[PDB]
Ligand binder design. Structure first.
Ligand SMILES: NC(=O)c1cccc(N)c1
Length: 190
């Protein structure tokens, strides 16, 4: 089982839900958390953990890791739990900042129907993922990998692509072990 239902009497549940509603902005009043589930994929967790340690040694930017959101469709949920996030299933809607997996800093964005469309029961899927944003650069329509660092840098590419280099709200990640789905929020409209 890649999904374990979290009980409301736990601190883990209350931290996920508090962080969700804090970033829900104008939607805070219009969205109800139905269910919270822990995502279990030990191989990815362990691989993510190694990636994390190498970025802590290397990166000029702190923090190396952010807790971001990813709204998805109901049929894509078993895929992410079992295999993690896959940039090859770019079907979703668009890839205006590159052909990667899109993460939002605020649940207010991921909770929009175009990202988390409700099923027939009105349940909307929003993954909580630990993402290794690292050193980021500007996203663009052509990107198949992170943006180029350009002159003044030893490395050729950044770790992630962003919507705005000044005040980022969207992060695009282009590596299979760079984002770890830790929870699934099943929410709905009031
Ligand atoms: N699918 C998503 O949650 C998401 C997050 C940030 C930006 C975009 N376009 C989508």
């Amino acid at each position: 089982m890649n999904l374990e239902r979290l009980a409301e009497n736990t601190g883990e549940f209350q931290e996920v839900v508090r962080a969700f509603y804090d970033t829900l902005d104008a939607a805070r009043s219009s969205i109800r958390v139905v269910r919270v589930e822990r995502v279990s994929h030990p191989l990815l967790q362990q691989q993510y953990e190694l990636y994390r340690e190498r970025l802590l040694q290397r990166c000029e930017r702190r923090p190396v890791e952010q807790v971001l959101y990813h709204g998805t469709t109901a049929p894509a949920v078993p895929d992410i739990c079992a295999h993690g996030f896959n940039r090859s299933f770019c079907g979703r809607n668009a890839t205006v900042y590159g052909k990667g997996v899109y993460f939002a800093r605020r649940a207010s964005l991921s909770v929009q129907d175009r990202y988390s469309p409700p099923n027939a029961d009105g349940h909307k899927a929003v993954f909580v993922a630990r993402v290794l944003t690292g050193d980021y650069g500007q996203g663009r329509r052509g990107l198949r990998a992170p943006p180029l660092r350009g002159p003044g840098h030893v490395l050729l590419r950044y770790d992630s692509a962003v919507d705005c280099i000044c005040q980022p709200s969207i992060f695009v990640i282009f590596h299979d072990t760079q984002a770890l789905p830790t929870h699934l929020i099943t929410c709905e409209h009031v």
